[PDB]
Design a protein around this ligand. Structure first.
Ligand SMILES: Nc1nc2c(ncn2[C@@H]2O[C@H](COP(=O)(O)OP(=O)(O)OP(=O)(O)O)[C@@H](O)[C@H]2O)c(=O)[nH]1
Ligand SMILES: [Mg+2]
Ligand SMILES: [Zn+2]
Ligand SMILES: [Zn+2]
Lengths: 124, 177
Protein backbone atom coordinates (compact mmCIF):
# COMPACT_ATOMS: atom_id res chain seq x y z
CA UNK A 1 0.00 0.00 0.00
CA UNK A 2 1.06 3.56 0.83
CA UNK A 3 0.89 6.28 3.47
CA UNK A 4 -1.87 8.88 3.73
CA UNK A 5 -1.58 12.36 5.24
CA UNK A 6 -4.88 14.21 5.72
CA UNK A 7 -6.30 12.34 2.75
CA UNK A 8 -7.93 10.03 5.28
CA UNK A 9 -9.61 13.11 6.72
CA UNK A 10 -11.02 13.87 3.25
CA UNK A 11 -12.17 10.28 2.73
CA UNK A 12 -13.64 9.63 6.17
CA UNK A 13 -16.02 12.51 5.49
CA UNK A 14 -17.43 10.77 2.42
CA UNK A 15 -17.57 7.55 4.43
CA UNK A 16 -19.35 9.28 7.30
CA UNK A 17 -22.10 10.71 5.10
CA UNK A 18 -22.37 7.39 3.29
CA UNK A 19 -22.86 5.49 6.54
CA UNK A 20 -25.54 7.97 7.52
CA UNK A 21 -27.31 7.20 4.25
CA UNK A 22 -26.99 3.50 5.05
CA UNK A 23 -28.70 4.00 8.40
CA UNK A 24 -31.72 5.61 6.77
CA UNK A 25 -31.78 2.90 4.12
CA UNK A 26 -32.01 0.31 6.90
CA UNK A 27 -35.02 2.15 8.34
CA UNK A 28 -36.77 2.40 4.97
CA UNK A 29 -36.24 -1.32 4.37
CA UNK A 30 -36.94 -2.17 7.99
CA UNK A 31 -40.46 -0.77 7.77
CA UNK A 32 -41.15 -2.68 4.55
CA UNK A 33 -39.83 -5.91 6.03
CA UNK A 34 -41.72 -5.54 9.30
CA UNK A 35 -45.01 -4.83 7.53
CA UNK A 36 -44.49 -8.02 5.54
CA UNK A 37 -43.81 -10.18 8.63
CA UNK A 38 -47.03 -9.01 10.21
CA UNK A 39 -48.88 -10.17 7.08
CA UNK A 40 -47.18 -13.57 7.44
CA UNK A 41 -48.24 -13.90 11.07
CA UNK A 42 -51.86 -13.43 9.99
CA UNK A 43 -51.95 -16.53 7.80
CA UNK A 44 -54.98 -18.52 8.95
CA UNK A 45 -55.20 -21.40 6.46
CA UNK A 46 -53.02 -24.29 5.30
CA UNK A 47 -53.11 -23.83 1.54
CA UNK A 48 -54.48 -27.34 1.08
CA UNK A 49 -58.25 -27.57 1.54
CA UNK A 50 -58.70 -24.11 3.02
CA UNK A 51 -57.17 -20.96 1.50
CA UNK A 52 -53.75 -20.10 2.92
CA UNK A 53 -54.55 -16.52 3.90
CA UNK A 54 -58.10 -16.20 5.28
CA UNK A 55 -58.72 -19.86 6.07
CA UNK A 56 -62.03 -20.42 4.28
CA UNK A 57 -62.42 -23.84 2.67
CA UNK A 58 -62.17 -24.26 -1.10
CA UNK A 59 -64.27 -26.27 -3.54
CA UNK A 60 -68.01 -26.94 -3.61
CA UNK A 61 -68.45 -24.10 -1.09
CA UNK A 62 -68.75 -21.67 -3.99
CA UNK A 63 -65.20 -20.42 -3.46
CA UNK A 64 -63.10 -20.46 -6.63
CA UNK A 65 -59.42 -21.30 -6.22
CA UNK A 66 -55.99 -20.94 -7.79
CA UNK A 67 -52.44 -21.97 -6.96
CA UNK A 68 -49.88 -19.32 -6.12
CA UNK A 69 -46.85 -19.38 -8.41
CA UNK A 70 -44.47 -18.44 -5.59
CA UNK A 71 -45.43 -20.42 -2.50
CA UNK A 72 -47.34 -23.16 -4.34
CA UNK A 73 -50.28 -23.04 -1.93
CA UNK A 74 -53.95 -22.78 -2.81
CA UNK A 75 -55.54 -19.35 -2.44
CA UNK A 76 -59.07 -18.17 -3.13
CA UNK A 77 -59.55 -15.66 -5.93
CA UNK A 78 -60.29 -13.14 -3.16
CA UNK A 79 -56.88 -13.42 -1.51
CA UNK A 80 -55.18 -13.79 -4.87
CA UNK A 81 -53.91 -11.43 -7.53
CA UNK A 82 -53.97 -12.31 -11.21
CA UNK A 83 -50.71 -10.92 -12.61
CA UNK A 84 -50.39 -10.47 -16.37
CA UNK A 85 -47.77 -9.61 -18.96
CA UNK A 86 -47.71 -10.15 -22.74
CA UNK A 87 -48.44 -13.89 -22.71
CA UNK A 88 -51.55 -16.08 -22.07
CA UNK A 89 -51.93 -18.34 -19.02
CA UNK A 90 -51.05 -15.60 -16.47
CA UNK A 91 -49.49 -16.46 -13.13
CA UNK A 92 -51.31 -15.86 -9.85
CA UNK A 93 -49.88 -14.59 -6.59
CA UNK A 94 -51.29 -14.74 -3.08
CA UNK A 95 -51.31 -11.27 -1.49
CA UNK A 96 -48.34 -12.08 0.74
CA UNK A 97 -46.04 -13.15 -2.10
CA UNK A 98 -47.08 -10.13 -4.15
CA UNK A 99 -45.91 -7.88 -1.31
CA UNK A 100 -42.88 -10.13 -0.94
CA UNK A 101 -41.86 -9.28 -4.51
CA UNK A 102 -42.39 -5.58 -3.88
CA UNK A 103 -40.05 -5.82 -0.91
CA UNK A 104 -37.45 -7.89 -2.79
CA UNK A 105 -37.36 -5.13 -5.38
CA UNK A 106 -37.61 -1.92 -3.38
CA UNK A 107 -34.90 -3.12 -0.97
CA UNK A 108 -32.42 -4.30 -3.58
CA UNK A 109 -32.44 -7.85 -2.19
CA UNK A 110 -33.36 -9.08 -5.67
CA UNK A 111 -29.77 -8.24 -6.62
CA UNK A 112 -27.81 -9.88 -3.80
CA UNK A 113 -30.47 -12.57 -3.49
CA UNK A 114 -30.57 -11.40 0.13
CA UNK A 115 -29.60 -8.58 2.49
CA UNK A 116 -25.80 -7.99 2.56
CA UNK A 117 -23.70 -5.99 5.06
CA UNK A 118 -21.14 -3.51 3.66
CA UNK A 119 -18.97 -2.78 6.71
CA UNK A 120 -16.42 -0.21 5.47
CA UNK A 121 -15.21 1.62 8.64
CA UNK A 122 -13.09 4.78 8.75
CA UNK A 123 -9.26 4.45 8.79
CA UNK A 124 -8.26 6.55 11.82
CA UNK B 1 -39.09 7.10 4.39
CA UNK B 2 -38.27 9.69 1.71
CA UNK B 3 -40.17 9.69 -1.59
CA UNK B 4 -38.72 6.95 -3.80
CA UNK B 5 -39.10 3.31 -4.84
CA UNK B 6 -35.62 1.99 -5.57
CA UNK B 7 -32.07 3.03 -4.97
CA UNK B 8 -29.37 2.07 -7.48
CA UNK B 9 -25.72 2.28 -6.52
CA UNK B 10 -23.51 3.10 -9.52
CA UNK B 11 -19.72 3.22 -9.79
CA UNK B 12 -17.69 5.00 -12.48
CA UNK B 13 -14.26 3.44 -13.04
CA UNK B 14 -11.37 3.85 -15.46
CA UNK B 15 -7.86 5.30 -15.78
CA UNK B 16 -7.09 8.67 -14.22
CA UNK B 17 -7.93 11.72 -16.38
CA UNK B 18 -10.34 9.85 -18.64
CA UNK B 19 -13.03 12.17 -17.29
CA UNK B 20 -14.96 10.15 -14.72
CA UNK B 21 -15.69 13.05 -12.36
CA UNK B 22 -16.53 15.42 -15.20
CA UNK B 23 -19.03 12.89 -16.50
CA UNK B 24 -20.60 12.98 -13.05
CA UNK B 25 -20.64 16.76 -12.46
CA UNK B 26 -22.28 17.07 -15.88
CA UNK B 27 -25.02 14.60 -15.03
CA UNK B 28 -25.59 15.84 -11.50
CA UNK B 29 -24.98 19.60 -11.55
CA UNK B 30 -24.46 20.07 -15.30
CA UNK B 31 -21.09 21.82 -14.99
CA UNK B 32 -17.77 21.33 -16.81
CA UNK B 33 -14.36 22.56 -15.63
CA UNK B 34 -11.22 22.29 -17.81
CA UNK B 35 -9.26 22.06 -14.55
CA UNK B 36 -7.93 18.68 -13.40
CA UNK B 37 -8.23 17.86 -9.70
CA UNK B 38 -7.45 14.17 -9.29
CA UNK B 39 -10.01 12.55 -6.99
CA UNK B 40 -8.86 11.46 -3.53
CA UNK B 41 -9.99 7.88 -3.08
CA UNK B 42 -13.75 8.09 -3.62
CA UNK B 43 -16.71 10.45 -3.52
CA UNK B 44 -20.37 10.32 -4.46
CA UNK B 45 -23.52 12.22 -5.36
CA UNK B 46 -27.22 11.49 -5.11
CA UNK B 47 -29.82 12.16 -7.77
CA UNK B 48 -33.46 11.13 -7.88
CA UNK B 49 -35.01 10.55 -11.27
CA UNK B 50 -38.42 9.34 -12.43
CA UNK B 51 -38.15 6.68 -15.10
CA UNK B 52 -40.10 3.59 -16.10
CA UNK B 53 -43.00 4.71 -13.90
CA UNK B 54 -40.74 4.55 -10.83
CA UNK B 55 -38.98 7.08 -8.61
CA UNK B 56 -35.36 6.02 -8.59
CA UNK B 57 -32.72 7.35 -6.26
CA UNK B 58 -29.26 7.03 -7.80
CA UNK B 59 -26.22 6.99 -5.54
CA UNK B 60 -23.44 7.61 -8.07
CA UNK B 61 -19.88 6.98 -6.87
CA UNK B 62 -16.84 8.57 -8.51
CA UNK B 63 -13.68 6.51 -8.01
CA UNK B 64 -10.00 7.44 -8.21
CA UNK B 65 -8.32 6.00 -11.28
CA UNK B 66 -4.78 6.03 -9.90
CA UNK B 67 -3.42 2.63 -8.89
CA UNK B 68 -2.80 4.28 -5.53
CA UNK B 69 -6.36 3.90 -4.20
CA UNK B 70 -7.10 0.48 -5.71
CA UNK B 71 -7.81 -1.26 -2.37
CA UNK B 72 -10.14 1.42 -1.03
CA UNK B 73 -12.07 1.88 -4.30
CA UNK B 74 -12.45 -1.84 -5.00
CA UNK B 75 -13.95 -2.22 -1.55
CA UNK B 76 -17.04 -0.38 -2.81
CA UNK B 77 -17.57 -2.62 -5.85
CA UNK B 78 -19.52 -5.35 -4.08
CA UNK B 79 -22.41 -2.97 -3.49
CA UNK B 80 -22.70 -1.75 -7.09
CA UNK B 81 -25.60 -2.62 -9.37
CA UNK B 82 -24.05 -0.97 -12.41
CA UNK B 83 -20.70 0.22 -13.71
CA UNK B 84 -19.57 2.86 -16.12
CA UNK B 85 -16.13 1.80 -17.34
CA UNK B 86 -14.78 4.71 -19.35
CA UNK B 87 -11.64 5.49 -21.30
CA UNK B 88 -10.41 8.47 -23.30
CA UNK B 89 -10.86 8.17 -27.08
CA UNK B 90 -7.64 10.19 -27.41
CA UNK B 91 -5.59 7.91 -25.14
CA UNK B 92 -4.52 4.44 -26.30
CA UNK B 93 -3.28 3.43 -22.86
CA UNK B 94 -6.60 4.09 -21.10
CA UNK B 95 -8.26 2.01 -23.81
CA UNK B 96 -5.69 -0.78 -23.37
CA UNK B 97 -6.53 -0.78 -19.67
CA UNK B 98 -10.20 -1.63 -20.29
CA UNK B 99 -9.57 -5.37 -20.30
CA UNK B 100 -8.02 -5.02 -16.83
CA UNK B 101 -10.83 -2.97 -15.31
CA UNK B 102 -13.13 -5.64 -16.73
CA UNK B 103 -11.24 -8.24 -14.70
CA UNK B 104 -11.30 -5.93 -11.67
CA UNK B 105 -15.08 -5.92 -11.94
CA UNK B 106 -15.40 -9.70 -12.29
CA UNK B 107 -13.35 -10.07 -9.10
CA UNK B 108 -14.81 -7.53 -6.66
CA UNK B 109 -18.45 -7.37 -7.78
CA UNK B 110 -21.55 -9.51 -7.89
CA UNK B 111 -22.82 -11.28 -11.00
CA UNK B 112 -25.89 -9.28 -12.03
CA UNK B 113 -23.68 -6.18 -12.10
CA UNK B 114 -24.46 -4.39 -15.36
CA UNK B 115 -21.57 -2.74 -17.19
CA UNK B 116 -21.47 0.03 -19.80
CA UNK B 117 -18.31 0.83 -21.76
CA UNK B 118 -18.01 4.57 -22.38
CA UNK B 119 -15.48 6.18 -24.72
CA UNK B 120 -15.28 9.77 -23.46
CA UNK B 121 -14.18 13.05 -25.05
CA UNK B 122 -15.70 12.32 -28.46
CA UNK B 123 -15.57 16.10 -28.96
CA UNK B 124 -11.80 15.93 -29.49
CA UNK B 125 -12.16 14.31 -32.92
CA UNK B 126 -8.79 15.85 -33.80
CA UNK B 127 -6.90 13.83 -31.19
CA UNK B 128 -8.88 10.61 -31.69
CA UNK B 129 -6.64 7.52 -31.54
CA UNK B 130 -9.23 4.81 -30.88
CA UNK B 131 -11.84 4.16 -33.57
CA UNK B 132 -15.51 3.66 -32.78
CA UNK B 133 -15.33 0.29 -34.51
CA UNK B 134 -12.66 -0.87 -32.02
CA UNK B 135 -14.47 0.26 -28.89
CA UNK B 136 -17.67 -1.27 -30.20
CA UNK B 137 -15.77 -4.44 -31.08
CA UNK B 138 -14.28 -4.64 -27.58
CA UNK B 139 -17.65 -3.91 -25.97
CA UNK B 140 -19.23 -6.81 -27.88
CA UNK B 141 -16.36 -9.07 -26.90
CA UNK B 142 -16.81 -8.22 -23.19
CA UNK B 143 -20.60 -8.35 -23.34
CA UNK B 144 -21.06 -4.66 -22.52
CA UNK B 145 -23.23 -1.97 -24.13
CA UNK B 146 -21.25 0.71 -25.95
CA UNK B 147 -21.51 4.49 -25.93
CA UNK B 148 -19.26 7.26 -27.17
CA UNK B 149 -19.82 10.55 -25.38
CA UNK B 150 -18.41 13.80 -24.05
CA UNK B 151 -18.73 15.38 -20.62
CA UNK B 152 -17.56 18.80 -21.85
CA UNK B 153 -20.15 19.07 -24.63
CA UNK B 154 -22.95 17.29 -22.72
CA UNK B 155 -23.38 14.66 -25.41
CA UNK B 156 -24.67 11.12 -24.98
CA UNK B 157 -24.06 11.45 -21.24
CA UNK B 158 -27.64 11.39 -19.94
CA UNK B 159 -28.34 8.62 -22.44
CA UNK B 160 -25.56 6.61 -20.79
CA UNK B 161 -27.00 6.71 -17.28
CA UNK B 162 -30.50 6.21 -18.65
CA UNK B 163 -29.38 3.08 -20.46
CA UNK B 164 -27.64 1.82 -17.30
CA UNK B 165 -30.79 2.40 -15.25
CA UNK B 166 -33.06 0.65 -17.78
CA UNK B 167 -30.62 -2.23 -18.09
CA UNK B 168 -30.64 -2.68 -14.32
CA UNK B 169 -34.44 -2.42 -14.31
CA UNK B 170 -34.70 -5.21 -16.87
CA UNK B 171 -32.36 -7.41 -14.84
CA UNK B 172 -34.60 -6.70 -11.85
CA UNK B 173 -37.68 -7.67 -13.84
CA UNK B 174 -35.87 -10.77 -15.12
CA UNK B 175 -34.89 -11.88 -11.63
CA UNK B 176 -38.55 -12.54 -10.84
CA UNK B 177 -39.75 -15.72 -12.59
N1 LIG C 1 -12.30 17.61 -24.21
C1 LIG C 1 -12.81 16.97 -23.14
N2 LIG C 1 -12.16 17.01 -21.95
C2 LIG C 1 -12.80 16.35 -20.93
C3 LIG C 1 -14.00 15.66 -21.01
N3 LIG C 1 -14.32 15.12 -19.77
C4 LIG C 1 -13.31 15.51 -19.04
N4 LIG C 1 -12.35 16.25 -19.65
C5 LIG C 1 -11.13 16.83 -19.14
O1 LIG C 1 -10.33 15.67 -18.80
C6 LIG C 1 -9.54 15.99 -17.59
C7 LIG C 1 -9.71 15.12 -16.34
O2 LIG C 1 -11.09 15.05 -15.97
P1 LIG C 1 -11.64 14.28 -14.68
O3 LIG C 1 -13.12 14.37 -14.86
O4 LIG C 1 -10.94 14.99 -13.58
O5 LIG C 1 -11.14 12.67 -14.86
P2 LIG C 1 -10.98 11.49 -13.74
O6 LIG C 1 -10.70 10.23 -14.43
O7 LIG C 1 -12.19 11.46 -12.92
O8 LIG C 1 -9.65 11.77 -12.85
P3 LIG C 1 -9.14 10.78 -11.59
O9 LIG C 1 -10.07 11.18 -10.35
O10 LIG C 1 -7.74 11.10 -11.15
O11 LIG C 1 -9.45 9.36 -11.94
C8 LIG C 1 -9.94 17.41 -17.16
O12 LIG C 1 -8.85 18.29 -17.49
C9 LIG C 1 -11.29 17.69 -17.86
O13 LIG C 1 -11.58 19.11 -18.12
C10 LIG C 1 -14.69 15.61 -22.27
O14 LIG C 1 -15.74 15.07 -22.55
N5 LIG C 1 -14.03 16.29 -23.29
MG1 LIG D 1 -11.71 12.89 -10.82
ZN1 LIG E 1 -58.86 -16.31 1.09
ZN1 LIG F 1 -47.98 -17.21 -2.22
Amino acid sequence: EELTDEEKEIINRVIARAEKMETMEQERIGRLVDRLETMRKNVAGDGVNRCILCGEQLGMLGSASVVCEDCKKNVCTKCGVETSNNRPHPVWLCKICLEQREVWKRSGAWFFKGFPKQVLPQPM
Amino acid sequence: SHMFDYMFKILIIGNSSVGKTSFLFRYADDSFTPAFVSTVGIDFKVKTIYRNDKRIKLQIWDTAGLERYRTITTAYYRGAMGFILMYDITNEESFNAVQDWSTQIKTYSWDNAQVLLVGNKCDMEDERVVSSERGRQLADHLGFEFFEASAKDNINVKQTFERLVDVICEKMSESLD
